[PDB]
Amino acid sequence: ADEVTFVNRFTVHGAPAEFESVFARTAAFFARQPGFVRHTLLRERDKDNSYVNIAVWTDHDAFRRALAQPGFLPHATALRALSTSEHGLFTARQTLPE
Amino acid sequence: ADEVTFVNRFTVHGAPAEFESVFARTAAFFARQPGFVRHTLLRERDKDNSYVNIAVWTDHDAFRRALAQPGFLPHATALRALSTSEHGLFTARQTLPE
Ligand SMILES: [Cl-]
Ligand SMILES: [Cl-]
């Protein structure tokens, strides 16, 4: 119930290999934060520059705290230098297997 | 690896309760298909009409075979009566924890 899922859709403008390298360090940063549960970076099949990240947090407060960390800035900056994003925060309604 | 992840973004134009009920039946239909791994239906926080579904399949062929089932067609008809959607098929690039 409390758990939140942040979903980002990226359009990569720069080199996808550089994007992935930057994202790996971004994810490691977030993995150091209290409340981090898991993440998966997905790449669209047959597209080169289309990515979706799914990140799970114990609660909304922990997610907001992570974004507000001073340590996030270089990662946020490096990501924005390479891509644009459309994103939203979600709660789970249904899961299978149950 | 071989796993594929299908991501759907729904904009619901009917009643959300009816959408969730019809979606549950469609999800059950896919859950019976060979190669189905898991799915999660997510609802955007502070919104009534925005959902994202994430579904994992063992491989691309299993996903294709499921989509091609004649039984899918009336399910699709019912779900699309209540919602529009934008979707894509993805491969996992990074996951934490490892
Ligand atoms: Cl800046
Ligand atoms: Cl069938």
Side-chain angles (χ1 to χ4, degrees), chain B residues 18-50:
Chain B
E18 191 179 353
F19 170 82
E20 289 188 5
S21 182
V22 171
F23 186 90
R25 295 207 83 252
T26 311
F29 169 87
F30 280 107
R32 305 195 290 272
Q33 305 302 317
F36 176 83
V37 178
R38 66 180 175 272
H39 94 91
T40 305
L41 180 74
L42 304 161
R43 189 181 199 174
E44 194 168 0
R45 274 182 110 255
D46 292 320
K47 302 201 184 187
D48 296 326
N49 69 339
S50 183

Coordinates of all heavy atoms in Angstrom, one line a residue, chain B residues 18-50:
Chain B
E18 N -14.6 0.1 -13.5 CA -14.9 -0.8 -14.6 C -13.6 -1.2 -15.4 O -13.5 -2.4 -15.8 CB -16.0 -0.2 -15.6 CG -16.5 -1.2 -16.6 CD -17.6 -0.6 -17.5 OE1 -18.0 0.5 -17.3 OE2 -18.0 -1.3 -18.5
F19 N -12.8 -0.2 -15.6 CA -11.5 -0.5 -16.2 C -10.7 -1.5 -15.5 O -10.1 -2.5 -16.1 CB -10.7 0.8 -16.4 CG -9.2 0.6 -16.8 CD1 -8.9 0.4 -18.2 CD2 -8.2 0.5 -15.9 CE1 -7.6 0.2 -18.6 CE2 -6.9 0.3 -16.3 CZ -6.6 0.1 -17.6
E20 N -10.6 -1.4 -14.2 CA -9.8 -2.3 -13.3 C -10.4 -3.7 -13.4 O -9.7 -4.7 -13.4 CB -9.7 -1.8 -11.9 CG -8.8 -0.6 -11.7 CD -8.5 -0.2 -10.3 OE1 -9.0 -0.9 -9.4 OE2 -7.9 0.8 -10.1
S21 N -11.7 -3.8 -13.4 CA -12.4 -5.1 -13.5 C -12.2 -5.8 -14.8 O -11.9 -7.0 -14.9 CB -13.9 -4.9 -13.3 OG -14.6 -6.1 -13.3
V22 N -12.3 -5.0 -15.9 CA -12.1 -5.6 -17.3 C -10.6 -5.9 -17.5 O -10.3 -6.9 -18.1 CB -12.6 -4.6 -18.4 CG1 -12.1 -5.0 -19.8 CG2 -14.1 -4.5 -18.4
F23 N -9.7 -5.1 -16.9 CA -8.3 -5.3 -17.0 C -7.9 -6.6 -16.3 O -7.1 -7.4 -16.8 CB -7.4 -4.2 -16.4 CG -5.9 -4.4 -16.6 CD1 -5.3 -4.0 -17.7 CD2 -5.2 -5.1 -15.7 CE1 -3.9 -4.2 -17.9 CE2 -3.9 -5.4 -15.8 CZ -3.2 -4.9 -17.0
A24 N -8.5 -6.9 -15.1 CA -8.3 -8.1 -14.3 C -8.6 -9.3 -15.1 O -7.8 -10.3 -15.0 CB -9.0 -8.0 -13.0
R25 N -9.7 -9.3 -15.9 CA -10.0 -10.4 -16.7 C -9.1 -10.6 -17.9 O -8.7 -11.8 -18.2 CB -11.5 -10.3 -17.3 CG -12.6 -10.3 -16.2 CD -13.9 -10.8 -16.8 NE -14.0 -12.2 -16.8 CZ -13.9 -13.0 -17.9 NH1 -13.8 -12.4 -19.1 NH2 -14.0 -14.3 -17.9
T26 N -8.6 -9.5 -18.5 CA -7.6 -9.6 -19.5 C -6.3 -10.1 -19.0 O -5.6 -10.9 -19.7 CB -7.4 -8.2 -20.2 OG1 -8.7 -7.7 -20.5 CG2 -6.6 -8.3 -21.5
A27 N -5.9 -9.7 -17.8 CA -4.7 -10.1 -17.2 C -4.7 -11.6 -16.9 O -3.7 -12.3 -17.1 CB -4.4 -9.3 -15.9
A28 N -5.9 -12.1 -16.4 CA -6.1 -13.5 -16.1 C -6.0 -14.3 -17.4 O -5.4 -15.4 -17.4 CB -7.4 -13.7 -15.5
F29 N -6.5 -13.8 -18.5 CA -6.4 -14.4 -19.8 C -4.9 -14.6 -20.2 O -4.5 -15.7 -20.7 CB -7.1 -13.6 -20.9 CG -6.8 -14.1 -22.3 CD1 -7.5 -15.1 -22.9 CD2 -5.7 -13.5 -23.1 CE1 -7.2 -15.6 -24.2 CE2 -5.4 -13.9 -24.4 CZ -6.2 -15.0 -24.9
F30 N -4.1 -13.6 -20.0 CA -2.7 -13.7 -20.4 C -1.9 -14.5 -19.4 O -0.9 -15.2 -19.8 CB -2.0 -12.3 -20.5 CG -2.3 -11.6 -21.8 CD1 -3.2 -10.6 -21.9 CD2 -1.7 -12.1 -23.0 CE1 -3.5 -9.9 -23.1 CE2 -1.9 -11.5 -24.2 CZ -2.8 -10.4 -24.3
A31 N -2.3 -14.5 -18.1 CA -1.6 -15.3 -17.1 C -1.7 -16.8 -17.3 O -0.9 -17.5 -16.8 CB -2.2 -14.9 -15.7
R32 N -2.7 -17.2 -18.1 CA -2.9 -18.6 -18.4 C -2.0 -19.1 -19.6 O -1.8 -20.3 -19.9 CB -4.3 -19.0 -18.8 CG -5.4 -18.6 -17.8 CD -6.7 -19.3 -18.1 NE -7.3 -18.8 -19.3 CZ -8.2 -17.7 -19.3 NH1 -8.5 -17.1 -18.2 NH2 -8.7 -17.3 -20.5
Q33 N -1.4 -18.1 -20.3 CA -0.6 -18.4 -21.5 C 0.8 -18.9 -21.2 O 1.4 -18.4 -20.2 CB -0.6 -17.2 -22.4 CG -1.9 -16.6 -22.8 CD -2.8 -17.6 -23.5 OE1 -2.4 -18.3 -24.4 NE2 -4.1 -17.5 -23.1
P34 N 1.3 -19.9 -22.0 CA 2.7 -20.3 -21.7 C 3.7 -19.2 -21.8 O 3.5 -18.3 -22.7 CB 2.9 -21.3 -22.9 CG 1.5 -21.8 -23.3 CD 0.6 -20.6 -23.1
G35 N 4.6 -19.1 -20.9 CA 5.7 -18.1 -20.9 C 5.4 -16.9 -20.2 O 6.2 -16.0 -20.1
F36 N 4.1 -16.7 -19.6 CA 3.8 -15.6 -18.8 C 4.6 -15.7 -17.5 O 4.6 -16.7 -16.8 CB 2.3 -15.5 -18.4 CG 1.9 -14.4 -17.5 CD1 1.8 -13.1 -17.9 CD2 1.8 -14.7 -16.1 CE1 1.4 -12.1 -17.0 CE2 1.5 -13.7 -15.2 CZ 1.3 -12.4 -15.7
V37 N 5.3 -14.6 -17.1 CA 6.1 -14.6 -15.8 C 5.3 -13.8 -14.7 O 5.0 -14.4 -13.7 CB 7.5 -14.0 -16.1 CG1 8.3 -14.0 -14.8 CG2 8.2 -14.8 -17.1
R38 N 5.1 -12.6 -14.9 CA 4.4 -11.7 -13.9 C 3.9 -10.4 -14.6 O 4.4 -10.0 -15.7 CB 5.4 -11.4 -12.8 CG 6.6 -10.5 -13.2 CD 7.5 -10.2 -12.0 NE 8.6 -9.5 -12.4 CZ 9.8 -10.1 -12.9 NH1 9.9 -11.4 -13.0 NH2 10.8 -9.3 -13.3
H39 N 3.0 -9.7 -13.9 CA 2.6 -8.4 -14.3 C 2.3 -7.6 -13.0 O 2.0 -8.1 -12.0 CB 1.4 -8.4 -15.2 CG 0.1 -8.2 -14.6 ND1 -0.5 -7.0 -14.3 CD2 -0.7 -9.1 -14.0 CE1 -1.6 -7.1 -13.7 NE2 -1.8 -8.4 -13.5
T40 N 2.4 -6.2 -13.2 CA 1.9 -5.3 -12.2 C 1.1 -4.2 -12.8 O 1.7 -3.5 -13.7 CB 3.0 -4.8 -11.3 OG1 3.8 -5.8 -10.7 CG2 2.5 -3.9 -10.2
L41 N -0.1 -4.0 -12.5 CA -0.9 -2.8 -12.9 C -0.7 -1.7 -11.9 O -0.9 -1.9 -10.7 CB -2.4 -3.1 -13.0 CG -3.3 -2.0 -13.5 CD1 -3.1 -1.7 -15.0 CD2 -4.8 -2.3 -13.2
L42 N -0.2 -0.6 -12.3 CA 0.1 0.6 -11.5 C -0.9 1.7 -11.8 O -1.3 1.9 -13.0 CB 1.5 1.1 -11.7 CG 2.7 0.1 -11.6 CD1 3.9 0.6 -12.3 CD2 3.0 -0.1 -10.1
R43 N -1.4 2.5 -10.8 CA -2.2 3.7 -10.9 C -1.4 4.9 -10.5 O -0.8 4.9 -9.5 CB -3.5 3.6 -10.1 CG -4.5 4.7 -10.4 CD -5.7 4.5 -9.5 NE -6.9 5.3 -10.1 CZ -8.1 5.3 -9.7 NH1 -8.4 4.5 -8.6 NH2 -9.0 6.0 -10.3
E44 N -1.4 5.9 -11.3 CA -0.7 7.2 -11.0 C -1.2 7.8 -9.8 O -2.4 8.0 -9.7 CB -0.6 8.1 -12.2 CG 0.4 9.2 -12.1 CD 0.7 10.0 -13.3 OE1 0.1 9.7 -14.4 OE2 1.5 11.0 -13.3
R45 N -0.4 8.2 -8.8 CA -0.8 8.8 -7.6 C -1.5 10.2 -7.9 O -1.1 10.9 -8.8 CB 0.4 9.1 -6.7 CG 0.9 8.0 -5.7 CD 2.1 8.4 -4.9 NE 1.7 8.6 -3.4 CZ 1.6 9.8 -2.8 NH1 1.8 10.9 -3.5 NH2 1.3 9.8 -1.5
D46 N -2.6 10.4 -7.1 CA -3.3 11.7 -7.2 C -4.0 11.9 -8.6 O -4.4 13.0 -9.0 CB -2.4 12.9 -6.9 CG -2.0 13.0 -5.5 OD1 -2.9 12.7 -4.6 OD2 -0.9 13.3 -5.2
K47 N -4.1 10.8 -9.4 CA -4.9 10.8 -10.6 C -5.9 9.7 -10.7 O -5.6 8.6 -10.1 CB -3.9 10.7 -11.8 CG -2.9 11.9 -11.9 CD -2.3 12.1 -13.3 CE -1.2 13.1 -13.3 NZ -0.7 13.5 -14.6
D48 N -7.0 9.8 -11.4 CA -8.0 8.8 -11.5 C -7.9 8.0 -12.7 O -8.3 6.8 -12.8 CB -9.4 9.4 -11.4 CG -9.7 10.1 -10.1 OD1 -9.2 9.7 -9.0 OD2 -10.4 11.1 -10.1
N49 N -7.3 8.6 -13.8 CA -7.4 8.1 -15.2 C -6.1 7.6 -15.8 O -6.1 7.3 -17.0 CB -8.0 9.3 -16.0 CG -7.0 10.4 -16.2 OD1 -6.1 10.6 -15.4 ND2 -7.2 11.2 -17.2
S50 N -5.1 7.5 -15.0 CA -3.7 7.2 -15.5 C -3.2 5.9 -14.9 O -3.1 5.8 -13.7 CB -2.8 8.3 -15.3 OG -1.5 8.0 -15.8

